[PDB]
Structure formats: C-alpha cells, structure tokens
Amino acid sequence: KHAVQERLAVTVCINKIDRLILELKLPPTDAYYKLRHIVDEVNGLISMY
Amino acid sequence: PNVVFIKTEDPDLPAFYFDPLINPISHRHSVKSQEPLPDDDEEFELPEFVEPFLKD
Amino acid sequence: KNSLAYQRMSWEALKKSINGLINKVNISNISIIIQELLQENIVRGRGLLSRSVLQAQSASPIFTHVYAALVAIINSKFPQIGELILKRLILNFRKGYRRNDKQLCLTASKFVAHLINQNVAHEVLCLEMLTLLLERPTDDSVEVAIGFLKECGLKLTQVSPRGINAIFERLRNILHESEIDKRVQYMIEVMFAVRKDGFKDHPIILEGLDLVEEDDQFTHMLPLEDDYNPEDVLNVFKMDPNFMENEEKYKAIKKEIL
C-alpha cells in the first residue's frame, strides 16, 4: 500500500523456500498451488491500491 | 517464526506426503488470472538432450 | 377367479400399505417400520419396494437418510433389494446429469451419498460419480459433486482418503486455474470448509442410520457407466402360478429373518 501511494517500482522476492520442502513436507503440485496463491493474493491486493 | 515440522505416524507414506495436519490449501480468488502467455503454434521445441534436471 | 382376485387384492392392498410405511418410517420407528415392511412381504413386491424407497429418497432431500436406513436394514438381509434401488438411483443420477436435470441428479446423488455412508455403495462408483461431476465443472456439476461431498465427503475419506486428496487437487485446479465465478469459487471454499472442519457438520450416519454390524452388511458395487438396469417394471404386478409355493417360501424367509 505505501509503495503504491508513493509510486515506486514494485519488486517481490519470495524467500525461505526450504520452509516448503524440509519444514512443510509439501508435494510439488500443492507447493506450486501455494506459490501461485501468494502471487495471486499480493497481485489482487496491488490491484486494490 | 514459529516452526511447523510435522511428525509422521508410520514410515510408510512418502517423504513428501500431504497429511491432513496441514490445512487444505483451497486458495480462492476472482477469475484467477491470465498471463502474457506465449502460445505455442508459432513455434518452440526442445532439442532432446536436456531433461528435467534430474528424473533418474 | 378366486386365486386371481386374491393376487389382485394382494398387490393392491399390499402395495398401498407398503407405500404408507415407506412415507411413515421414522428414526424412533426405524426398526419398527422396517419390521412392518417385513411383516408385509416386501420382496413379493420387490420392484415397488425399490420404487417406494426411490420415491422417498428422490422427493425428500431430508428423508433420504431415512429411506436409506430402511435400505440398509433390507439390504444387509436381501442385498438384491437395495441393489435394484442402487441401480435405479444410478439410472436417475445419470438421467438428471446427462439430460441436464439439476434436481433429478441431486435427488439421485443424495440417495447414492446416503448409500455410500451407510456402506451399501462401493467407493469406486462414488469416485466415478465425483469424477464425471468434476470433469468439466460448471456451476451445476461443481455444486453436484460438492453437494454429494457435503454428506459423503466423510465415508470416501475414511475408507480411502486417496479420494479426498484427489478431490481436493482436482477441485482446486479446476476452480483455481479456470474461468469460474463466485459460485464455484465459494463452492470450493465450502468444500474446503467441510474438509478443514473434519466432516463435523455431516458425519457418516446420524444415530440410528447405521446399526448393522461390521461384516454383517452388504456393499454391492454396481457402477455408473456400467450398463445397469432399473428392472422397475416389477412395479406393475404379475400373475402367479407358483403363488402358493413362493408364498410359503417367502413367508418362511421372513419368519427365519424376523
């Protein structure tokens, strides 16, 4: 929200990806599901602002 | 950051194995999205030397 | 003559009374109504018994479980009876779906979900029903699978959680990479709601809909696209030269069966 209201460039780095593999134990398809989800949520929210 | 490492019951079911313990993802949204999607039928093709980097 | 008029009076008064007991059967009258449906020879009119059961489970979204308890009572004992009813409800479900009848499909699918939770219906046909429901999910078939799963998400997940995880993957991808609207979006949300709720709003069978013991039951597997039949013309009666022989036989079966 703050970055939109001040019109900057918009970069996103999803980090800490072992937390899906060793910590979460998520098979790859549903792993992709969660990744797509984070992406679609943040994108819809930027669409909000 | 709370760690969530889920104990298994048996050795049997695979290492990666979605267990009921995790909450079912079911991510919902609007009409989800579309992309700058580079349709095929223009062309693209994989010189069959590479592989998904390890499948063996 | 006399025997003819007797078979006709049998068919008439018998079928009328059996349909009365069909619409009368309660939960505080489950074993009572089933033993009255036995005090009358329900197998002599096995076709119209399947027909009364089907009529109840179709026209009553709220007495499908009661018609089902009757079906389980009579099906652990005479499996062919609930079997004709099962082939019938499969005919009615494929009727509603393949003719685009939402209400018919929903009636028959509620009947089949009651059967699957009572353990008179096998899990491969439930899987095929979920799969042919979710193949090209639009509002209607998405709600059809989800409505089936509203009651039968428990039994499939408890006998084969494989089907539950498969349903979750298929529903999530068909509704999360495809062009569906708030209907199927919130429908997937409801599906996940039951899932995460642990089937606590709708367990297998409320008190009195499953009392038959572990292996004393009958889950016969007649699937969806298998060319089954209704065999429902037995809803119209038929003349009987072996009326006395088969009468002593079936009255002896009901006496030996209680």
Side-chain angles (χ1 to χ4, degrees), chain A, chain B, chain C residues 5 13 20 45 47 56 59 61 68-69 72 79 82 96 108 113 121 137 145 147 153 161 163 166 193 198 203 208 223 230 241 252:
Chain A
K1 202 158 175 183
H2 214 205
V4 132
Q5 277 109 36
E6 278 309 351
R7 332 172 40 239
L8 298 302
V10 167
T11 299
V12 165
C13 203
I14 292 209
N15 199 319
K16 228 175 188 164
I17 310 179
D18 53 352
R19 310 212 43 173
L20 302 144
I21 317 179
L22 298 148
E23 227 185 294
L24 253 190
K25 279 169 158 178
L26 271 188
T29 80
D30 321 83
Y32 179 52
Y33 278 29
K34 215 168 143 47
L35 254 157
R36 202 148 19 111
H37 188 30
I38 298 141
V39 153
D40 66 42
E41 294 272 285
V42 50
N43 239 341
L45 255 284
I46 313 200
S47 85
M48 209 51 269
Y49 309 144
Chain B
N2 191 309
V3 339
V4 271
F5 146 69
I6 22 228
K7 183 42 43 176
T8 329
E9 51 146 324
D10 65 17
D12 299 328
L13 306 102
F16 311 73
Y17 154 61
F18 200 108
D19 185 284
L21 218 159
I22 347 149
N23 268 26
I25 315 199
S26 174
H27 65 345
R28 273 304 139 254
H29 225 18
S30 205
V31 181
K32 298 316 217 126
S33 82
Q34 187 34 22
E35 310 308 283
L37 216 47
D39 289 290
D40 77 306
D41 308 350
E42 3 133 326
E43 49 219 330
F44 187 99
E45 209 280 0
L46 290 180
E48 48 222 344
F49 281 8
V50 302
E51 255 267 346
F53 218 122
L54 261 209
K55 314 206 86 103
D56 60 350

